[PDB]
Subunit: 329 residues, 4 copies
Amino acid sequence: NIVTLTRFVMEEGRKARGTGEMTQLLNSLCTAVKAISTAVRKAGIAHLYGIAGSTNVTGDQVKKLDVLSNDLVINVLKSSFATCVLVSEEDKNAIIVEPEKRGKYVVCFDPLDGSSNIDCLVSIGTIFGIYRKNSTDEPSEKDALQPGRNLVAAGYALYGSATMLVLAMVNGVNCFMLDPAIGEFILVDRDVKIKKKGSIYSINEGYAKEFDPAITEYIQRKKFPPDNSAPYGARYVGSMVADVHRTLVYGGIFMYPANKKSPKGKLRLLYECNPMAYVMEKAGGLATTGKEAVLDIVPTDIHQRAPIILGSPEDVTELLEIYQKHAAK
Amino acid sequence: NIVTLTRFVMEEGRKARGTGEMTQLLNSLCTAVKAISTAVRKAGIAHLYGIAGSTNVTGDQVKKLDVLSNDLVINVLKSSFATCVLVSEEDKNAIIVEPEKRGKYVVCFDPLDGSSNIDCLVSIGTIFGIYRKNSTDEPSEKDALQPGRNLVAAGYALYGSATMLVLAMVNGVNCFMLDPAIGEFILVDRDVKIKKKGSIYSINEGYAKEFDPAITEYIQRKKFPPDNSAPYGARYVGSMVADVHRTLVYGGIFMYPANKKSPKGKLRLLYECNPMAYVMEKAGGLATTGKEAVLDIVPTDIHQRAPIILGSPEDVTELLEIYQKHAAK
Amino acid sequence: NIVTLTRFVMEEGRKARGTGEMTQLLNSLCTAVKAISTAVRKAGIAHLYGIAGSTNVTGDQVKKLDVLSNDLVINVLKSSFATCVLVSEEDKNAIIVEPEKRGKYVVCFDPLDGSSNIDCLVSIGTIFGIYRKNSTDEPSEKDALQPGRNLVAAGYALYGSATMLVLAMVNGVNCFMLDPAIGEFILVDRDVKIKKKGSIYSINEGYAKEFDPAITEYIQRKKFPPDNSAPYGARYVGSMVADVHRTLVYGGIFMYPANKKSPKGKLRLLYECNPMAYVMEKAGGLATTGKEAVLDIVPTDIHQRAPIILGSPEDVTELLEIYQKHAAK
Amino acid sequence: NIVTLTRFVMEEGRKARGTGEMTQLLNSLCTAVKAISTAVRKAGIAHLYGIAGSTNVTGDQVKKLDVLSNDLVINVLKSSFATCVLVSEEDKNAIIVEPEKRGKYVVCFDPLDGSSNIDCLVSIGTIFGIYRKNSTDEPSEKDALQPGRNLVAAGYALYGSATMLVLAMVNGVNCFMLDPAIGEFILVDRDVKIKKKGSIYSINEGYAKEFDPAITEYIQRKKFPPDNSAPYGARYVGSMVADVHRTLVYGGIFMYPANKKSPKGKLRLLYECNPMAYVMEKAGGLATTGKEAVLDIVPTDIHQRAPIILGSPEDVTELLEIYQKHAAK
Ligand SMILES: O=P(O)(O)OC[C@H]1O[C@@](CO)(OP(=O)(O)O)[C@@H](O)[C@@H]1O
Ligand SMILES: O=P(O)(O)OC[C@H]1O[C@@](CO)(OP(=O)(O)O)[C@@H](O)[C@@H]1O
Ligand SMILES: O=P(O)(O)OC[C@H]1O[C@@](CO)(OP(=O)(O)O)[C@@H](O)[C@@H]1O
Ligand SMILES: O=P(O)(O)OC[C@H]1O[C@@](CO)(OP(=O)(O)O)[C@@H](O)[C@@H]1O
Ligand SMILES: [Mg+2]
Ligand SMILES: [Mg+2]
Ligand SMILES: [Mg+2]
Ligand SMILES: [Mg+2]
Ligand SMILES: [Mg+2]
Ligand SMILES: [Mg+2]
Ligand SMILES: [Mg+2]
Ligand SMILES: [Mg+2]
């Protein structure tokens, strides 16, 4: 039978005999994602260009998509009464939910990942990671400073040619396609597993002058295979959500290592690296900084950055072995 | 004064004192693009997954997006009664329109550009080029073998985070955003001009082992600028329509040179190279094979391939100079 | 804060400490209603008229809206795993849900009320009534033969100028507007109460020659008020769902008494009369046959018909008093 | 061969060898109707209920549907550069188009017909009538005071279960169904003709005490046929556009005669009576005040009211005969 995300989450909540708080949280997230998707596809843009004249608005209201997306996630999540602490890629400080709407979950999210791709209409998305508050003390940012291994759920919504929500939980990864005609996420790929080895590598090679020797050696190997096999194809959309999703469904490797401007990597641990690392591991893939598992890093800053290498097991392992080789010399 | 694509096309037609065929042709194209966009965004996918049970469908009908898009363009274009010859990236032979629906225009198109990106939901699109039938004899594939310089109109529809139709004609390039709420393309960027020089290079570096010396030297300059300026950023979505659109709005350079498997490049002259070269030149950019202007190539086969380098004039000119350097002596 | 139907039902299910079966049932109903609404608004009709040619369909598939709506409700309800017996206005026999998807709820529904108004595009809708199975015996039609007073939930979806779902439960009536942009039902009217007295009467006067003396006297009073007040306005859309909804929000009276062709009334007790009678009483209105409360009738036939008079308390009471007056002579 | 309203309008324009103003005018009307339809179906209502919090709106902007619809028609029509005078049911004075956007057509319209039905979600619509400016002097309200017989085009958009645009011109009436998925009006019924005799009568019988003897006798015949034939069914949605549309597709009669408060009828001649009378006559129906043809009335005020009886020729003729009967002697 057909399974909607709403039914899927409701059923999962009944299997774990939960209070239904996670269910309400996920339902709220779904609503936020649909609202963001409709805005991203520019529904109603004609009004902004004066189709009905200029009488409605009486001042400023041309809210950018990134700001709107952040507002939607924050407002819809608070209204779920299932959260206590929120960490957004767009906010310098953690948001502490009011007692009246306070729940037990901590949510770290990137409302509209792929800032540089917004104006050129390339794929963008929303990334999220959910933790259970493990403290009796008053909620604070410390509750969001948990290693990714502690995630109870993570995933992303990709606003690409079509909108898809990928949800990973303890039991596995599932993909739901948004049917905009009825505003329903339809389960189309169950218990997804990434290919053991891919044929695509994804990295911004513009930083080549600053890559460490391991990354450098690896890329050279993708272009000039020592076994004389066909070189890997290259793909770099520029939005983490898009490149990671392709990595999941096609296999291969995604990399954002450290460079001069970003000595500890560019991508953020809480709402970029951990969520994707969790999705990858639940799908049978790997996620490493090149020296340690991303999910095992205990953060000390909600906006902490980290180098990341993720994707097909055999591909990530080959790169890890290069790092280990250099360290053994 | 909001301007819809319908109004824009209608006006341009009344100024050129044209009969009205081009206007009808463009109106038809717009209709086809909206139908493709809705299908690409997966509207109604719930029905394919049995939301209403299995009673309506009595056999096969799970038509893939590329085939559906091709069917939409061919059917909608024929219904315009403004075309006589159609060349599709999906069909081996040129399509000759029946006398009953025969018009004076020749249309070369790529129904759903970015085949490899369809399944991973990355941006895809539709590319088109329109020619006026020159000869007076019976229409045939030869009517589609005109140099791009002869184009009367060209452009593309990008099904990205939002859907946009970019239309280039004799007087310039205009960008229309599709407002899915009312099925109207809204003029949002008029007489667009590409920046003289960008800071992004776009190419599949997986073919590095097979690049000619000029491409190789150029890429080395983007990563290790000889004058110690800032290295360029890299972006390669993998769908020509998406990479070219970003090149248009952000500036920079897009390249798909020849390699071992594709000795004369991979991209097709009639419905990929020429349309984009026309958009670029009308926007103040350049489009070359590295040795000659794309628009001046005399096509000898409807599915002829050609190497292509396009984008900001200063970036393309620099690469042209390198080719000259490696051609001297 | 904003409240979606999904959150509303989820919260209600948590307050009654239910197993979550009713919640899954209502969520499924919402999905079905959205699917019916999109079909009713004719989304995708262009495909039926050959926009993409004729290659997809390979036979018959032009399913009428009433049949499609029935298929959607049946399939989506069965998939909720919350029902055991279904009674449809379109099916001669009660549907007994398979053991594997069997739940404890009985649902009586009118998939697309207002058959005569379908082709002229006048408002139509879906009516539903939900009962708890009160028997340990194998599920059968007998489980649907309960008086309306036993309903646990009832309501309707109106596909009018906009789509609205009206849900009545033990605690009251709430109205949710469907926002088609995001596929979400938004709570817009809470704990709705009908006006004590209205100024509109709704009945098909074409049957005047067959009305009983009470109905006849009442209508004459609406046109020629004995107190010389302004006569009531008349409205009869022809679809019960539309006329009843207006009665609820504007007040007044709706009537479908017995006539020659329909000696026991035309409207069906299980999926037309009871659901609307329940909504009315929960909103402070009344629903009578003219001699007894609709909700107190113990049915003996799943397709049993009944005369019905419903709406504002003072209006229905005035008509009841006429019936009582005649019976006292 | 699917036919869109855009193509139909374009073709009709190229056949009449018209300049293109009417085509531009109709294209603009279509755009306005789609924008009104989307607003009527409540797309985006979630934003009004705080789904994204309260940060975007900085004041009043909760524009009611009737005002918004009026703004859409006026603005979109002006942008067509094809009109010089506009008369709206919502505005006391005629609107004179600025010389810069001044065209040759005069448009009389009812932006959102069915005011009383807006809040209860019953069908509503937009009615329009188009005239060609006759005189050569400065445009004024007088240019809108032409008898309906002078109309060059008229029709309406019905926002019912689905949205449909009915367009009547010199050669006939055509019905286009709006496919909201692609924002295209699809021709579904060509050269429509009303049945010679129907079996439905439509009138607000609440004014029975004030009806003239002819209307009274006629209604008595519909309920108690003198020849003992089957009584007619009654239907009165309450929105002229909806009742008239049903009359067109199902046949029968629609009436709004004079009463005490409305001695010359309630419906307005310029944008309600004339447009519908034109549609009716082009469909083989009739439209009379009971004493004269509606289309032959010489308007003396832009908001002049007139009694109207329209529909199937045999039904209207019967009522005309009754009026003659009560006029003899
Ligand atoms: O431009 P570069 O340095 O490649 O960085 C792109 C990466 O950073 C991110 C961070 O969100 O994009 P962006 O800064 O444009 O928002 C990721 O989406 C993406 O993977
Ligand atoms: O996979 P590579 O060799 O980079 O080729 C991608 C290029 O070819 C095209 C040809 O259409 O993609 P694809 O073959 O996947 O359809 C272009 O869209 C794109 O620019
Ligand atoms: O045509 P009449 O006899 O007025 O009956 C209309 C009534 O019957 C119903 C029954 O569903 O319509 P219909 O038979 O056209 O489906 C109700 O919707 C409506 O109230
Ligand atoms: O309420 P009554 O007097 O029946 O008037 C309804 C008639 O008037 C109109 C005038 O537009 O409705 P309304 O005043 O509610 O806008 C017509 O749509 C309709 O036919
Ligand atoms: Mg990001
Ligand atoms: Mg950022
Ligand atoms: Mg292509
Ligand atoms: Mg191909
Ligand atoms: Mg019914
Ligand atoms: Mg029926
Ligand atoms: Mg009106
Ligand atoms: Mg009014």
